[PDB]
Design a protein around this ligand. Sequence first.
Ligand SMILES: [Ca+2]
Ligand SMILES: [Ca+2]
Ligand SMILES: [Ca+2]
Ligand SMILES: [Ca+2]
Lengths: 606, 606
Amino acid sequence: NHHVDYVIRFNYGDIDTPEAIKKFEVLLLELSEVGLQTEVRQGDENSLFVFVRAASKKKLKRAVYQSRVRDWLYGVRNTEPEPASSAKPQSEAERLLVIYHLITVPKAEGGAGITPRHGEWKNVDAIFPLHDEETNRQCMREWSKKTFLSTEDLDRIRNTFGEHVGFYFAFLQSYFRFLMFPAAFGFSCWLLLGSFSIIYTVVNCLWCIVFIEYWKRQEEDLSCRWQTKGVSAVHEKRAEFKPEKEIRVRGVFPATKRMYRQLLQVPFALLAAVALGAIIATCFAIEIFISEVYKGYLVFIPTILVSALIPTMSAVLLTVATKLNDYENYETQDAYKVALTQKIFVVNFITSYLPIILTAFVYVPFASRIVPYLFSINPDRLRKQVIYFTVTAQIVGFALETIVPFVKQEDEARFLTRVRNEAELEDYDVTDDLREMCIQFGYLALFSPVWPLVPVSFLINNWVELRSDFFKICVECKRPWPQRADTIGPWLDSLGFLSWVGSITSSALVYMFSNGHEGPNGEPTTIRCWALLLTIFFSEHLYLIVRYAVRSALAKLEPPNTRRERIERFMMRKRYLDTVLSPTERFWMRQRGWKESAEVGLSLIT
Amino acid sequence: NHHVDYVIRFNYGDIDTPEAIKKFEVLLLELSEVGLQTEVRQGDENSLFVFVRAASKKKLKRAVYQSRVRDWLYGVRNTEPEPASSAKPQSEAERLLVIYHLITVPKAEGGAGITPRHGEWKNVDAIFPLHDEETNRQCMREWSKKTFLSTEDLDRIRNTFGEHVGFYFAFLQSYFRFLMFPAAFGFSCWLLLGSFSIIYTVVNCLWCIVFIEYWKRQEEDLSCRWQTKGVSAVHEKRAEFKPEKEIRVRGVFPATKRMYRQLLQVPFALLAAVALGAIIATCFAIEIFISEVYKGYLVFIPTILVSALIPTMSAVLLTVATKLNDYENYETQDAYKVALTQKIFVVNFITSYLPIILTAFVYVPFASRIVPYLFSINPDRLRKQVIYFTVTAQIVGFALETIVPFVKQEDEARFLTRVRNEAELEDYDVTDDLREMCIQFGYLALFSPVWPLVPVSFLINNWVELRSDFFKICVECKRPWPQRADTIGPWLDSLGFLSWVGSITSSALVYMFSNGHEGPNGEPTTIRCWALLLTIFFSEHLYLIVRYAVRSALAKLEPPNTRRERIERFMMRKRYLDTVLSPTERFWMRQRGWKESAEVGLSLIT
Ligand SMILES: [Ca+2]
Ligand SMILES: [Ca+2]
Ligand SMILES: [Ca+2]
Ligand SMILES: [Ca+2]
């Protein structure tokens, strides 16, 4: 890579020439005044990117010791900072993270001011590091053959690509690994019993409880292991944040006003729910009427209708959620990303689980009681849609995930072109992959009693998807900068909610389908709503009781890295304490020493 | 008090004379070898108590600096220990707590070995401090007149009687204070509307949610204020603990074996539930048949039956719970007390809320459908039992709390008799008073839609009960030793569970009684169990949604003491850091300084 850390794509297309060269000179002054060596090279037809390297080894050592000092002070490291003359960077992640903080974190603390495209420049499109292609191809061809990734492999996806990708890859490993028990139980139940089986439903809800509690425990242990536990204290501030007052330099904003702006989440959620429910239910009723009332060239209208109407409405809701998320201030980038993710999860929940719920609950149980207003319903509609969403939708999702973007794409002559064709790749966001895994866990927690080969299909697809996501990161994207994290984000409570409703939906399914597969064949006159709500009541409360039992069991087992990170915070204070910090009386005149008190005791006992 | 800190009642009644004097000499040796001045005086007819004072001011200063060092090291204090020559004890609580640690915490760390009555002595009945009667009477007559206790008053009940009593008194103050909104709303609803009113039920569930979340916030703030946040790390070990192995000196026990012994909680809970349910339901059916089927001298059998059969069964269940709580090891005293409290809360729940539930749910809705097997039921049975349990049971509880134990009870001549008549008082346990307040909150959260003057009665009784509990502590008991805590214990999650079921029970009540007070008059043929379970379903899920909203709102508002205790843990580390700890290169040979890079930039832009 010729020691090049970062590439800063300065643009000059839409900006006139003297303003562009003034912006360029002010960009290159703050890079030399922060300790970074710059080398400008010709970019695209209308761009000009500047390479960035730490200027000297002593400047890099002084800049990486003052980045270990800061997160030791803010309670992340819990052990003393190594001295600066012996403080070499541990890996590529620490070096690239220090260089990115020197580039982006503003001039109040000591870094440069470069915020990409937002506030003063509006020209620097991206600040991307370069790939380590030999190590990437070695890791790809090394663990394209192993059945399970080791902790050394997870530490290599920590040392490259940072910790925010390493937490996702450890989550995917600990999710493919824990899929083996419901995979074996689902194969056993689909071979032995039929679908809608009670022991498979209880086993599946117990497995979701156990997996969620074990991954909360493993997240705490892994954030203690990777020295990134309290990384919320050193989160990167943002320049879009507009403060009210200034109390000494941080620019505070009253959090109650942000709560009152956060209460717009409920009308946005109601609008998104009503609009997406109207579109999906209208498409579903159109498909039902056209396909089973009134043809082979006329069955294809509602599928093209959702394929050309759902992503447009979802992009409109994404725009409205972004415009509302800029209204609330959110001084850090992590709070903004978590708020945007919690906003789009409602759209993702409705878009992902509304067809299976109308077909499973509104379609199978009523249908005839409706169709005359517009029956001998198709009994395999629910099984066919679960089979579709689990197998064929995952096949086409893997297709449009990694095959379609691959088909879509002197001495420095090869390097200046490999950076140029790495400049056009896609910026990698790990929330999309966490979204895919969480929607998949939602399918497995909600509609697994229909067709219990769903965990088997998810096991095979997860083993393919781990390697495919690593191939996408190393090949089809720019390198993500080493972002740190402690959890996977709001996806933890998303997974808890997903399983939470799964405990209601699967129990309602195994109640109302315990008469066959056709379940409540059309018109519902048999289903007894006094027996449909009692099983939901008792199953949800047994779910909550067993979940409380498992969380109270797993809380009392301290993991080794947490038990080693609450001991070093005693050892550091013990080392601090050794390095520095160096009438009435006539009642007590009778018995002086402890021998005469024993004499009065023996004299009073005898 | 003539500077006397503690009184250690050595017994010699059942022990023969040479063994008693050997135990006495070994008791008095370890007191002089730990730094405490002893003065033995004649006790009761068959006891002999030894007074204990710190021997010298320098020894007390060295013993109180090494007790600030320890909880600074274990992460409780978060600020540097003051030097020992200027480390005077802050109040009576710190001095008496240091003297109690020197008396009781065993010889591995530096204290003496005196465990009361357990392991080697089996004679020292109690180690009680002496009352500060002038300050106690001054505080009693000072805040027997004020409407609300100030934070200085709460800090005085912290400085005397420690922090475990101060947390309860702050809880009772913050519970009497937050009773004013449901008191005013219940008076407004009982004057304007009738009983079983929907807006009063929604307001009451919202008030329970808000009060529980605010008291969790205030508990965190108060444990940060009183410098006792992480006091779980310095909990007092116990001598009943029997360890498996010894790894360097703590005596570890495998926690999975304690989990497997903790799984006996479910058969004990089933046994207690079935037995107490059988006794209470048999008494209730006997009372119903005798009082309303078949007399004035014959109505009094079932009341004497519970008054002579419920406390005997509860004492049997207390004995079984103690024998099971000694089976599980529980190395600390706080874990043992929390486990015993969580065991007796099931007995307290069933004994406290089973008559109102059978009368409200089993009696009002069926009754005739039952009585022929043994109707025009009495409509005011539920209102009369709620009125009884809220008003008259609280009056007789205040009576048997403080009036009956008061009627039941040379130069050193007055002092040796005031200690002698303080030796016979009752050892004060704050879990009984927290149990009374939590059972009262359970009544208010479960059965307030019946007769909505229940929060008004609870407001008056709580203002009386705060002063009466302080009178009981200062007058009718020995002084409790200054035990530290951070929460009130498991009563927090007890209160959450209490309100949790209240959201089901009150909604079922206001469904099935929205036809009058008689509700489902006898035989149930009107109540529609498809409408009884939908309101329970929707009300419980709206309860959980609003509770999640309130906890997510109150989590984002940092209290001032927590925001000052996460800043001093930056300041201490910042003070530590200042007191101590002092081919490839041909690509980077084109442009040396940032001026020539700007020259290449202008040459490439132009
Ligand atoms: Ca996929
Ligand atoms: Ca993926
Ligand atoms: Ca009382
Ligand atoms: Ca009391």
